[PDB]
Scaffold this active site. Structure first.
Site, short mmCIF file in Angstrom:
data_model
loop_
_atom_site.label_atom_id
_atom_site.label_comp_id
_atom_site.label_asym_id
_atom_site.label_seq_id
_atom_site.Cartn_x
_atom_site.Cartn_y
_atom_site.Cartn_z
N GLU A 34 -37.38 26.06 -12.92
CA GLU A 34 -36.05 26.17 -13.68
C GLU A 34 -35.45 27.52 -12.80
OE1 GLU A 34 -37.89 27.53 -17.32
OE2 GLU A 34 -38.64 29.48 -16.18
N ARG A 35 -34.16 27.49 -13.31
CA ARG A 35 -33.39 28.58 -12.80
C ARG A 35 -33.66 29.68 -13.85
NH1 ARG A 35 -30.07 24.15 -12.60
NH2 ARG A 35 -29.05 23.93 -10.51
N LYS A 62 -28.58 19.64 -24.65
CA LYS A 62 -30.03 19.06 -24.28
C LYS A 62 -30.95 20.20 -24.98
CE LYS A 62 -30.64 18.47 -20.21
NZ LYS A 62 -30.73 19.03 -18.65
#
Lengths: 478, 470, 478
Positions: free
Chosen positions: B190-191, B164
């Site tokens: 997000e992480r 991705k």
């Protein structure tokens, strides 16, 4: 300190609460200092609950609220045709202001039981499948239900286009649609020339929930003016599902207790009050009419949901669209299994009535012959002929985008299909056969077309047969 | 006057009081700067946004950071306008938090830079484009099967370890190279380590020289986790309007944006909607998406990653998102295991642009033929894996041959993968790829080995490679 | 003007409301009249919602409430190693007090996105199944989700013990566990000799809710000290679900508005704030790391609940434990079908990387054909070979308790199984074969063991094959 002019107290999420306004009536229009209109819903002991119709960012606590002295109103007139307006009646396309002189209240009583009359006139939707299996009258309230990306909007535009010459006004009301989609729709309508007799009322997603909730009432209120003057009107609500979502959000913000699926119990009344104004008046009242074609968006083709049940209860009949057949590019399946027009049937002219029965029987048979019967070659009885003829019917039931077919050519092609004239030509040439068939009728079939247009009845069967046979001889198989 | 004082603190939600008649408008921003007057205090620097007016000259706001150490009585300074974010070329190649302050170590933006409000009314009806356009991305699969519309929204499914990030980088690089349009990445929820790795990857690949990134970490309060998407969008709008060039906007996760909205609404105290979501979910989504449009002198096209909760396509958040999408691309583990990139599904992926009125009758027919051939191959694979090719007739053998050739030709080399392979990549125009696919369908090049269709792109490179091995 | 003193208004269920305390800060520490500690959560216009941190039966309305001026802080230092401590920082095991000379706030910002580096070092758990299939690298937060009575605490204890030789410092945080289980765990750790480098933080089920709410934060704050000093830390929580339950109860008592499943609005914020402080610092910060292994219990394997869903979304991967497999007897009953570790691949040494893939594909192939084993009508060359290989691999993957296996022996046995050398040994003697092979390798495989230890790479394949052939020859089939 005179208290005929209010003063704000609380503001939040589009709901204000003014203090004062002694002589205000429920449902009146109030305008703030910014120039934003407002609804007055609750008249409590001291304060007044106001709903804001517009951008509530600029309204601050301590502002002054004025009265207008008019209940919820919308400008109506002949000058409104060809424009694009927000539910409050203000132009949004530029092109200068609008010259209107009369108005009509948003909430008005529906016609009484004595005022209505049984519907008996057809509404040519320009789609062969619809006009064959699920006919629509000129006073009906027919639901069109299906999943997303299923050409429902396409059906709406074809229906609006086909009325180019039937002396009927039309109104397209878009709820929660994207502004780009609305712009493309307006552009294609202008390209095909329908803007001489249409009105578009828009309420995009960015617009507030009060406007989303108020748009359909504005549309039907515009319609009622022509309806009572004595013309015929067609109105196409876009997403009653999104309107219901907006009303649910408004209710839960106003601290009311929800019901099933968090919907307040008032949703059925909200829909019925809107839809019940679509009726065919008697000859004494003026002979007007108003037909509606609301849409509903489902999830995974589930009719069991609360809103589909409510709307299907209110409506006269439903037209279901199947998602799986949309992949093959066909006009999405007019599923005759669930489709029904209880009011219709009396609206169809006898010319098309003479054939609708055999189309229904043929489609039922072909659909009932599933893949289990399609398997193998053991089916050597009349089932092979049934399958071939059903394939012919399915192939002829397709249509192109924005291609309205007049009822005369519709009945001609459908009769040719039924009387065996198409049982020989391979199924891959049926479309070109139809095209050259229309060209042949245009160049020679003037007597047949005129007779159908004038008498609403089939011509001499022998003459029609010999003309079809002549076209067959002049046709070339690929 | 601007001075106001705190009267109530409940977790992330704080309340302020102002002198009567000087209340700030909705959505404004309040700055709190305090110095520890003694040892029983802590220095605090916090920014709040105004949400509700409770009357009595009080205001209900929410916080953008930790509220610990707050005392009832601190002065509150009103800015008079919503959150302002720097815009212009200075933003490119930098990383910002929700408030427009750089996170990296490159330095602070000078104060004189032009700034813009976050919240903004959507563009009017008049300014919109009157017709649909096709965004030519140069990646064969997408511009063949699922084209992208100038000004439309595009959904992107797929898990981890599928390429991705590589696809994102390739799209950014191709768009920049062939259109002069910048791109903006907005990492909603997000992480942190995944975001750091993405930043390192982009910096090493050199794409970052023409992009601007906004990061909202999962450890931030719901206010920031809601406003990061809006600040990214208002970063892109400047380039759309002033520069008049086509821009790309990514959103790392929109389901998390909806979840943060639900949490902040619950904190505010409104009754929950159907499945506990906020009542205003639909209008919040609308106010976000409606600014991603295409006007007379620019466009914004959005690539948004979607995570479905509990794998239910009828959940309210996925339903609301899908009400806006124009196309969908799916990334598949199986295509990843096979030596095929970008491993996009050729059957699950779909589009709205796939219509003769938009792409053209020839393109539409070629695409439909490819679709049905691949479907037929998929049908035959199950029986062939147990029966061998012997039972296959001549026509089905030809179909399988052509389907294998097509499926292998769908792959492409990337300018990104140069660092690991050395292949200079390719940018395949739509006309060239459709002509090549039609010719391969016609059977003209059936004698070549299938591996000659591997990682070329244009149709000429196929024959050149085939001649290369001879 | 009362500024640092206040009087109690209401008491009950560990919640007290005080009047005054105008100069208190949210999240401060407050001392009651009899010495019970308390933290102030809510600051209203006239009352300060206090939460009591001990036996609250001794507080009557009208008690004096004092101020401390200190944000919540915990003792920390090197003296805490080998002690059992409640979250407040006091010893519960006797053995005198502690000598912590420095304290830090429990609420600190997580390290920024510019101070982190990609994880690149292995965390050797010593469990063959997880170490081969779902690896864990230092700096990764991996979730171990399983139902009750599925050896979760067993796995935790083995991975705590296995760190004896490395440089890791491990911290075990007990939330809601029975004091009996905590005592037995402490005793077995002492017997294995791990208490010289570990700290245990306990919050029994009998303790008041705020202590359960605070335990994870106390553990993480204790770990961050060794973070920033430059060491490596491993921390384990047992019940994030029970901590969430305690926080929900506290919020509901303090009259905060509820959300899903009556949970307060910021439960996801709480969990994310707790877990995001686990990362791998860059070289500029010293190179420390902290890996977290939270446990979540699901009832009948319902991973669809709110708390498991949130923790799954937060963390970097799942390790699934199967009740049915544990009942069948498989230890540790790792469901490798559903477990995933996004960090994996880069978290393994090269020697294990060169061998893991083949075994992974073998397990994937065998898992789908478990229903074929009922009948011998199977196609022998492929399907029966897969069944035999899968049974052998599963039997190898079984393991006993409290016996970690060094990585060199793990990779040795995995290589031997992968290269097909075990297709001859009966499936009911593989465990004895494995034990005898470990004994033989300890006998004369020390050269290969040293090479693997010092190079993280596979030894010479010829010599390895010769040694395994010698052992196979010297083995006796039972």
């Amino acid at each position: 300190q005179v208290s005929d002019v209010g003063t704000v107290i609380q503001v939040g999420d589009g709901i204000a609460r003014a203090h004062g306004l002694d002589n205000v009536m429920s449902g009146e229009l109030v305008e703030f200092a910014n120039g934003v209109m407002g609804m007055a819903l609750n008249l409590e002991e001291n304060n007044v609950g106001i709903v804001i119709l517009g951008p509530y960012t600029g309204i601050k606590e301590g502002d002054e609220v004025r009265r207008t002295g008019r209940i919820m109103e919308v400008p109506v007139g002949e000058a409104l045709i060809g424009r694009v307006v927000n539910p409050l009646g203000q132009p949004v396309d530029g092109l200068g202001p609008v010259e209107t002189t009369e108005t009509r209240p948003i909430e008005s009583p529906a016609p009484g039981v004595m005022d209505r009359r049984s519907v008996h006139e057809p509404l040519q939707t320009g789609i062969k499948a619809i006009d064959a299996l699920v006919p629509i009258g000129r006073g009906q309230r027919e639901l069109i239900i299906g999943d997303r990306q299923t050409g429902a909007a396409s059906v709406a535009i074809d229906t609006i286009i086909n009325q180019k010459d039937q002396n009927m006004i039309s109104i397209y009301v878009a709820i929660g649609q994207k502004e780009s989609t609305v712009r493309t729709v307006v552009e294609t309508l202008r390209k095909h020339g329908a803007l001489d007799y249409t009105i578009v009322v828009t309420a995009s997603a960015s617009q507030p929930a009060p406007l989303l909730f108020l748009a359909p009432y504005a549309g039907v209120a515009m319609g009622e003016y022509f309806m009572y003057k004595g013309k015929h009107v067609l109105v196409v609500y876009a997403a009653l599902s999104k309107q219901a979502a907006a009303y649910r959000e408004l209710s839960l913000l106003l601290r009311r207790p929800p019901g099933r699926e968090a919907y307040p119990g008032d949703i059925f009344y909200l829909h019925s009050r809107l839809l019940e104004r679509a009726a065919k008046l008697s000859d004494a009242k003026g002979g007007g009419s108003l037909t509606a074609l609301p849409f509903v968006e489902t999830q995974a083709g589930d009719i069991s949901a609360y809103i589909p049940t409510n709307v299907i209860s209110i409506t006269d009949g439903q037209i279901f669209l199947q998602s799986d057949l949309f992949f093959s590019g066909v006009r999405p399946a007019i599923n005759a299994g669930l489709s029904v027009s209880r009011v219709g049937g009396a609206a169809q002219i006898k010319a098309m009535k003479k054939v609708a029965g055999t189309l229904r029987l043929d489609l039922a048979a072909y659909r009932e012959l599933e893949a289990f019967a399609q398997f193998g070659s053991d089916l050597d009885k009349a089932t092979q002929a049934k399958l071939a003829r059903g394939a012919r019917t399915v192939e002829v039931l397709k249509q192109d985008l924005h291609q309205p077919i007049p009822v005369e050519k519709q009945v001609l092609i459908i009769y040719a299909l039924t009387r065996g004239f198409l049982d020989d030509i391979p199924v891959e040439d049926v479309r070109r056969f139809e095209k050259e068939f229309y060209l042949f009728l245009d160049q020679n079939g003037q007597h047949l077309l005129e007779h159908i247009r004038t008498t609403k009845d089939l011509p001499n069967e022998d003459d029609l047969n010999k003309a079809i046979e002549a076209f067959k001889k002049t046709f070339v198989v690929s | 006057m601007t001075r106001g004082r705190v009267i109530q603190v409940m977790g992330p939600v704080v309340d302020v009081k102002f002198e009567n008649g000087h209340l700030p408008a909705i959505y404004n921003a309040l700055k709190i700067q305090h110095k520890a007057r003694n040892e029983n205090e802590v220095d605090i620097d916090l920014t709040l946004e105004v949400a509700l007016h409770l009357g009595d000259d009080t205001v209900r706001t929410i916080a953008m950071a930790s509220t610990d150490g707050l005392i009832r009585g601190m002065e509150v300074i009103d800015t008079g306008a919503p959150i302002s974010v720097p815009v212009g070329e200075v933003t490119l190649g930098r990383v910002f938090n929700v408030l427009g302050e750089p996170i990296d170590l490159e330095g602070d933006i000078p104060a004189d830079a032009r700034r813009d409000p976050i919240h903004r009314p959507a563009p009017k009806f008049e300014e919109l484009a009157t017709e649909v356009e096709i965004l030519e991305t140069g990646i064969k699969v997408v511009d063949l099967l699922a084209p992208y519309i100038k000004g439309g929204k595009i959904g992107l499914f797929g898990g981890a370890g599928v390429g991705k990030t590589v696809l994102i980088q390739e799209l950014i690089h191709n768009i920049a190279q062939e259109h002069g349009g910048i791109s903006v990445f907005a990492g909603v929820g997000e992480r942190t380590r995944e975001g750091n790795d993405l930043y390192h990857e982009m910096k090493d690949s050199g794409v970052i020289s023409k992009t601007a990134m906004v990061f909202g970490q999962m450890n931030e309060p719901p206010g920031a986790r809601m406003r990061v998407a809006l600040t990214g969008l208002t970063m892109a709008e400047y380039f759309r309007d002033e520069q008049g060039q086509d821009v790309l906007l990514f959103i790392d996760n929109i389901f998390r944006f909806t979840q943060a909205g639900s949490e902040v609404s619950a904190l505010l105290g409104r009754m929950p909607s159907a499945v506990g979501y906020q009542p205003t979910l639909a209008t919040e989504m609308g106010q976000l998406q409606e600014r991603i449009t295409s006007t007379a002198k620019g466009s914004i096209t959005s690539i948004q990653a979607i995570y479905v909760p509990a794998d239910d396509y009828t959940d309210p958040a996925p339903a609301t998102t899908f009400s806006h999408l124009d196309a969908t691309t799916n990334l598949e583990r199986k295509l990843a295991e096979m030596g095929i990139y970008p491993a996009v599904d050729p059957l699950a992926s779909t589009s709205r642009a796939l219509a003769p009125e938009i792409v053209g009758e020839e393109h539409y027919q070629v695409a439909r033929k490819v679709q049905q051939t691949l479907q037929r191959y998929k049908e035959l694979q199950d029986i062939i894996a147990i029966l061998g090719m012997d039972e296959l007739s001549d026509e089905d053998k030809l179909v399988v041959h052509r389907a294998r050739r097509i499926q292998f030709f769908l792959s492409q080399n990337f300018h990104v993968a140069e660092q690991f392979t050395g292949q200079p990549g390719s940018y395949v125009p739509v006309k060239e790829t459709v002509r090549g696919f039609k010719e391969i369908l016609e059977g003209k090049y059936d004698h070549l080995p299938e591996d000659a269709f591997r990682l070329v792109g244009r149709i000429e490179e196929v024959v050149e490679k085939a001649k290369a091995m001879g």
